[PDB]
Amino acid sequence: TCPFYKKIPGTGFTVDAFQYGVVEGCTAYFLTHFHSDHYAGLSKHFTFPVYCSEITGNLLKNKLHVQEQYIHPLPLDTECIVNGVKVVLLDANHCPGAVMILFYLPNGTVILHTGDFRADPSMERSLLADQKVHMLYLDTTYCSPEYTFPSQQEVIRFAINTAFEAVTLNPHALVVCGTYSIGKEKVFLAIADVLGSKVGMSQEKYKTLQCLNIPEINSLITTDMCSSLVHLLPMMQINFKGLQSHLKKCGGKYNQILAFRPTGWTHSNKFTRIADVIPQTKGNISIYGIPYSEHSSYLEMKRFVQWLKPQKIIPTVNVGTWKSRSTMEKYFREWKLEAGY
Ligand code: NI
């Protein structure tokens, strides 16, 4: 059965609710982004209308084989009418094609559902600026002050400088980057760009990236591994055993691996500046964990919410435990008293 925090009251609508079978009363299923925890349940046999971005719709059609007649892509930043209700999709600063949804209810209530997001001050000048929001369905992934991490730009700077140094020192070093879902493409694209290489990957991953509307993508990626010195592999294989094995397969073209694991937050964030990050090393293989987040930090989330001044907040992440729920509710109250709404 569908939880309450996936239902939009006063509508026939649900958000990211594909794993409950037919939800009673649902006339239209929204999908915020193409991440498995959110799309779980969709397939070629799904027969209800799915509303989403152009990019999520490309992935539904090509990767999950959803039939085209049930895919309803909407433009961003544009007022659209769905089953008689005005809606707007806004960029979520998450993975490619990820959206926030604004719903203008028939009775005058305005609801913002953030999907998964990384809050940014640029959102303060989108269509949110123009009107009041009553209820906020909020991505609370990192809702606790211990969750600090650098900007995406600082992290990419570190990665580019690190890769360029290593390969200029040793022209026979291979760079590997871990992946398991869409998102975080900047990591591997910025590194291949500084090295003058395309990025090499499996056919299944190339197919996924070809759905993303990234400009000049045919220029940046390839399935010919032999021609590339930046390789993508599954995240599970970014360990000393799995990297050793991959190096065997390259046939003596290379004698060293420098690998990157873009994680979210890790506890080494509470002690270490990005500048000071060091790898784990075994022989001719080094592994960097880099804190490239596509969710809000605590301070970014706080700022967004204190700017929006919602009347009610409904968390969508960390809702399973009472300790989590109580922690989150205390921070919402702090924020409201400090800003005075
Ligand atoms: Ni996500």
Phi, psi of 256 (to 5 degrees): -160, 150
Query: Six-digit token pair at 110?
Result: 């305005």
Q: Give the 3-state secondary structure of 235-276.
A: HHHCCHHHHHHHHHHCCCCCCEEEEEEECCCCHHHCCCCHHH
Distance, in Å, from the CA atom of 214 to the CA atom of 134, rounded to the nearest integer, reads 35
Q: Ligand 1 center to residue 179 CA distance, Å?
A: 14
Report the separation in Å between the CA atom of 211 and the middle of ligand 1, taken as the mean of its atom positions.
17
Of 257, 106, 98, 92, the closest CA to residue 178 belongs to: 257
Alpha-carbon separation of residue 98 from 16, 69, 116, 210 (angstroms): 12, 21, 8, 16
Tally of CB atoms within 10 A around 131? 9
- Asked if residues 185 and 215 have their Cβ atoms less than 8 Å apart, the reply is no
Q: Report how far ligand 1's centroid is from the alpha carbon of 83 (Å).
A: 27
**Cα 263 to middle of ligand 1, angstroms:** 13
Ligand 1 center from residue 264 Cα (angstroms)? 11
Angle at 271 between CA 267 and CA 272, to 5 degrees: 100
User: Are 332 and 302 spatial neighbours (Cβ–Cβ below 8 Å)?
Assistant: no
Distance 70 CA to ligand 1 centre (A): 23
1 alpha carbon – ligand 1 mean position (Å): 22
From the CA of 276, how far away is ligand 1's center (Å)? 28
In which element (H, E) is residue 160 found?
A: helix 152-169
Report how far ligand 1's centroid is from the alpha carbon of 294 (Å).
Answer: 8
Angle, CA 310 vertex, CA 306 and CA 311 arms, to 5°: 130
Q: Which domains does the chain have, with CATH numbers?
A: 1-147+296-341 (3.60.15.10), 148-295 (3.40.50.12650)
CA of 333 relative to ligand 1 center, distance in Å: 26
State in Å: Cα 185 to ligand 1 middle. Answer: 14
Give resolution, Å, one decimal.
1.5
Neighbours of 76 (CB within 10 A): 16
Ligand 1 centroid, distance to 337 Cα (angstroms): 30
| 94 CA to centre of ligand 1 in angstroms | 7
Angle between helices 152-169 and 185-194 (to 10 degrees): 40
Do 92 and 32 meet the contact criterion of CB atoms below 8 Å apart? yes
The rounded Å distance from CA 116 to ligand 1 centre is 5
The beta-strand segments (E) located in 145-192 are 173-179
> Cα of 35 to ligand 1 centre, how many Å?
5
Q: 176 C-alpha to center of ligand 1: Å?
A: 23
CA of 259 to the centre of ligand 1 (A): 23
CB 15 within 8 Å of CB 116:
no
Q: Supply 233's token pair.
A: 């592999």
Element (H, E) at 220: helix 217-220
Give the Å distance between the CA of 340 and the centre of ligand 1: 31
| Centroid of ligand 1 to alpha carbon of 274 (angstroms) | 24
Please name which of 56, 51, 67, 55 lies closest in space to residue 11, comparing C-alpha atoms: 51
Please give the structure tokens belonging to residue 283: 């022989």
Phi and psi torsions of 71, nearest 5°: -90, 120
Distance 173 CA to ligand 1 centre (A): 32
Neighbours of ion ligand 1 (CB under 5 A): 35, 116
How was this one solved? X-ray
The span from the CA of 338 to the CA of 1, in Å, is 38
3-state secondary structure the chain: CCCHHHEECCCCEEECCCCCCCCCCCCEEECCCCCHHHHCCCCCCCCCCEEEEHHHHHHHHHHCCCCHHHEEEECCCCCEEECCEEEEEEECCCCCCCEEEEEECCCCCEEEECCCCCCCHHHHHCHHHHCCCCEEEECCCCCCCCCCCCCHHHHHHHHHHHHHHHHHHCCCEEEEEEECCCCCHHHHHHHHHHCCCCEECCHHHHHHHHCCCCCCHHHHEECCHHHCCEEEEEHHHCCHHHHHHHHHHCCCCCCEEEEEEECCCCHHHCCCCHHHCCCEEECCEEEEEECCCCCCCHHHHHHHHHHHCCCEEEECCCCCCHHHHHHHHHHHHHHHHHHCC
CA 119 to ligand 1 center in whole angstroms? 14
